[PDB]
Amino acid sequence: HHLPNITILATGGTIAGGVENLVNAVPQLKDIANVKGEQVVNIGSQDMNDNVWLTLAKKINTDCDKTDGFVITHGTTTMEETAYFLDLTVKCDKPVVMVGAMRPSTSMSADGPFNLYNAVVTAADKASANRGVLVVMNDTVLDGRDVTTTNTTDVATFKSVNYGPLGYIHNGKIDYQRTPARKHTSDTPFDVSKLNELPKVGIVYNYANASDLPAKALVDAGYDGIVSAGVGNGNLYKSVFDTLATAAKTGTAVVRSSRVPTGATTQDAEVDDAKYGFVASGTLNPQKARVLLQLALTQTKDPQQIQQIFNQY
Amino acid sequence: HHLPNITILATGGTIAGGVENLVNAVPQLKDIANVKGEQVVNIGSQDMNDNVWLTLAKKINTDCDKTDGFVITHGTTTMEETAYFLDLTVKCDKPVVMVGAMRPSTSMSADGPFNLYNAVVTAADKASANRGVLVVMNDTVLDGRDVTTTNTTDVATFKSVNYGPLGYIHNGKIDYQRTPARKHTSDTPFDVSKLNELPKVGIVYNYANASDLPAKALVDAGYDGIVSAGVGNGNLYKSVFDTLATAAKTGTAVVRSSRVPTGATTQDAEVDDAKYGFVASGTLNPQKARVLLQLALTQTKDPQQIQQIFNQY
Amino acid sequence: HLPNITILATGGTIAGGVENLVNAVPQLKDIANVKGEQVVNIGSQDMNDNVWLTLAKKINTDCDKTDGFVITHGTTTMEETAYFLDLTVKCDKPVVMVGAMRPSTSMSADGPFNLYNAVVTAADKASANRGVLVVMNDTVLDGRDVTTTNTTDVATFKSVNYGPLGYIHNGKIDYQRTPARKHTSDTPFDVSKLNELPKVGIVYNYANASDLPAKALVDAGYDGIVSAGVGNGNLYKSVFDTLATAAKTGTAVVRSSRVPTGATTQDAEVDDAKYGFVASGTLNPQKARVLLQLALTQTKDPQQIQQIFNQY
Amino acid sequence: HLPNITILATGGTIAGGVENLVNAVPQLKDIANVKGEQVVNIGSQDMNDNVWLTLAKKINTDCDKTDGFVITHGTTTMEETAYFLDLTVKCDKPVVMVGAMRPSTSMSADGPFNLYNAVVTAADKASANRGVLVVMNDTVLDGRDVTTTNTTDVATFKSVNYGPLGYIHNGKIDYQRTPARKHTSDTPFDVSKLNELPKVGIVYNYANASDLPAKALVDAGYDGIVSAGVGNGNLYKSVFDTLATAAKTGTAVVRSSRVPTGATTQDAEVDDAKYGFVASGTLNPQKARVLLQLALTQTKDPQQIQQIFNQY
């Protein structure tokens, strides 16, 4: 019979070819779906922020019943953060698919048009429901939790570096062989429909001879939470460790992640988490650990509980 | 005729099996070289710092004539930083080889013994001279500039993620097919033999809704230089960009690197470097960009000159 | 009350006979009651159909007598045996394969810790119902996707298209994935009455390829030929012509690829419908052989072989 | 004064005949004076010895008439042609190969930007003396190590053992590496008088492997056989016995590996000295064929073939 209705929510510039005119930039979209577009905000992905996240999640939650699936156009710099936020806060189990482009739309061999096409194909496929928020880039379907950018410029940068992709797309057909095991979307307790702001969580970097001043500035300003981008398996330079130990004793939530791009920051391996009240991020990298910590702090300030959240989501 | 003399400088705990007794932990070392060991410092790699670096570089430079090659035992967390520092400051063109272990020496299938063996094999091979400071891990020879840790726990974590390894080791023989093109060791102008400290350079992280407070703390404390771990191709969150723009106008050196684990942060692509007085790090990740910036600042505070250094070393 | 784990050996020892293992790796005692048995003693590179049938029958038979199985197997052909077992084992208890890239007498031998992690894996209840597993280098990999990516590296084993199922740290496994394709007790393949498998060989494509290998297999009456194609399963002209003719005579022909990752997709490069060819999807040539052998025990029709290739 | 770059085409067009290219990619005009010529018109999967000899002769002949060459070639066998040219081209001007993973009429076709970057590469003086290059997905790769890693991905081309030579950003190349093995004008191989190459075929190893492919090649008088071995170049028993016998009769036998990265090392698994076998090092089977063909134009002694395999 008929084609699904897919809504395209844009957050920034056009990635192909005016969100209302996408069907004229990529006319092949008409054969896959009845497409409607809305510009929700217009900003550079590098300036992505908590208000945009709250706005997007509310919009998807409210409009879930009116459409068969969503495609979100988003810049590549912070795609991985936005995707995990929505993966935790969207209560709609219809396909929510994010997509961007590594090359500008006017450039030779621009990747955006085919990325957009494939994203609409993903959002229109019934098998894509109930898998969480998805990122479609370079002929691959990736889950919002594991997905990250691995290269500054490559069209193939987006990968799920720990657990792999969910599926591959070839000629408008998707071979799914995986689905994420951690809880997402409608299975999480996080509800943002009444929040107009989120807890303050910052990130500090570790390295040889690291200054403690970044950590001290965040504590002095009353941050709710601090993520450490540790060295190796979440290790801290001594002055950073002293400042964070004190902070965690006096009510700051402290998550140990790693600057190292793959693998888990594991619980009491290098550092005695139970003694200091620290939380280990597992496979969440620093920027994703921030997202989960922010949301955890809307429900609890207890480190043992926060740790359990980091083991479930 | 006879075996080379190799000196093993240790910075921390034993990686096999007491630096003087390594020849009893790995007796096969005797067949490859006449080995001597010295404990230079004893610290956790996560607490690595500028004084240790200055001490190591002086020691290698002074002792260069007394030995055929050096092996340095070092923890894995900051190996990649220490290696690049020495790659720029060591004036000895005999093999300088760093080595560590991802598993403790008492654990089942400890990687250290064979890593140590292979490191001594590398340091004893005449073909290893004139290639810069080398890291030997998991049967692979890696140059100190490109080498980084890719996984929190894997024995195979060390990779040269942009340009690849220099050689592979199989049965005590190395097949070298590459050598680094950027200038190293005795071809650089950096000389640390008279320095008892280095310029202050810190790192700030970018992410959605990033605080500018870490950057402001470093500027207020008079840091000489700031490396930004940007999003994508070295992009900055707006408040971080405003603070750094001001800082660079008033004499702080500012290098744009990326949190993204591979690829170059390229010069005037995303950001107008010439307008703001910023320097693009190319393929140096944030912690390595710090090392080069520190050394650049012992010779110049001019951004155009600093950029040229970042294009040569 | 520790689980009972059976170790079935197929070759030499990977740590330190088969009942010496608890002496070689004393930490095993703390995690399982281990019993060992030497099923065959063969080098992995000489792995064959008989060993496969034997292993599947032993596991299917002893399923109710133990809580899980660890099979010690050499690394060269581990990926083939693992997938065969993945399709033919009807025990849904953990079945975990393990080997070693370095010999047991070498410095920093990988076998002991690998063996220890394999037993940890087979003893964990969360490992059941995931199909046949390979445990190497602290990683838990599914039998369909796992392949060896490097000739000598201890980290060689990877699931190159869809990734691992779990990682192991201090004896605990973080499972975040399970394979979607049907395995073990969900397959129709039953080897309990078979003493032999259909004959399936493999030919390689490259520039200026001889069609002689393909002709030698056709002339010998092979039931099936898998092509290790160039790119997206393409064939050198002369090999193509030999295989189009054999397909018309009822030889089953599967297009796979010499290229180490990605699917050989259906009807994209070659018109499979027209020549009666089957596309392997993500199965590399040696894995596509395994499935084709089994498919041929149920059917010789290409369209139904294609569907099997789309479900298992 | 822009460089003169010649585009030699071997098949269809990768952007948009061969002189239409400057209309298809107008930005080329700003970086080079481009002349095009269609040397053959063949699908990459049917690539053969004749096309190789022709391309090497054309480049060797026209070397002094142009500043660099771009060769448009289909992706399936690009890695083979690139290495053949790398050993036989005596022009030390840039020779750059390029192709496309998506067809020119598809959405987000990769050929135009690839072609543009290839011409950029051939026009840059820093590209000379690095041997024959492949330029794909903003990356500059050497002809010996480059291989295709995925069946469909635009990013498929990688130098999987030693990495790329350079990356291209906004028309500038950051070169940080050059290949150490001898190439182009440093090799002894000269194809200028040859109308044919020695016959070298490829056999695959796997569990329960037939020795029929190997026998079909021996019986036909092949000069050389490359084995795509399991693990570190191992051979299934029956294939081993067939090839040990052929080696004794003077067939040249090279052990390579089906495993996609790492070296097939000398005397490690198999005693090469004793059977007269040669180990391929990092050359995969299809690349090892190329070098073996050329080695056989100078010598039939295994020890000297081994040395060639250790130098080129």
Author numbering:
A (entry chain A), B (entry chain A): -1 to 15, 31 to 326
C (entry chain B), D (entry chain B): 0 to 15, 31 to 326
Text lifted from the article:
We found that the structures are practically invariant within the pH range explored in this study, both in terms of the overall fold as well as details within the active site region. Therefore, we will describe only the structure of EcAIID90T/K162T-L-Asn50. Somewhat unexpectedly, we found that in all three structures one of two independent active sites (in protomer B) was occupied by a citrate anion, despite the fact that L-Asn was present in the crystallization buffer, which is illustrated in Fig. S2c. The position of the citrate in these structures differs significantly from those observed for EcAIIwt-apo7 or for complexes of EcAI. While the active site appears unoccupied in protomer A, there is a blob of the mFo-DFc electron density adjacent to the side chain of Ser58. Its size, triangular shape and particular location suggest that this peak may represent a carboxylate moiety. Since we cannot unambiguously interpret this electron density, for the purpose of refinement we modeled it as an acetate anion.
L-asparaginases catalyze the hydrolysis of L-Asn to L-Asp. The genome of E. coli encodes three L-asparaginases, called type I, II, and isoaspartyl aminopeptidase/L-asparaginase, respectively. The active site pockets of these enzymes are shaped by two protomers, one of which forms most of the active site scaffold, including all catalytic residues; it will be referred to as a “major” protomer, with the second protomer called “minor”. Yet, as we demonstrated here based on the reinterpreted structures of EcAI and the new structures of EcAII, under some conditions a citrate ion can be accommodated into the active site cavity and even displace the canonical substrate or product.
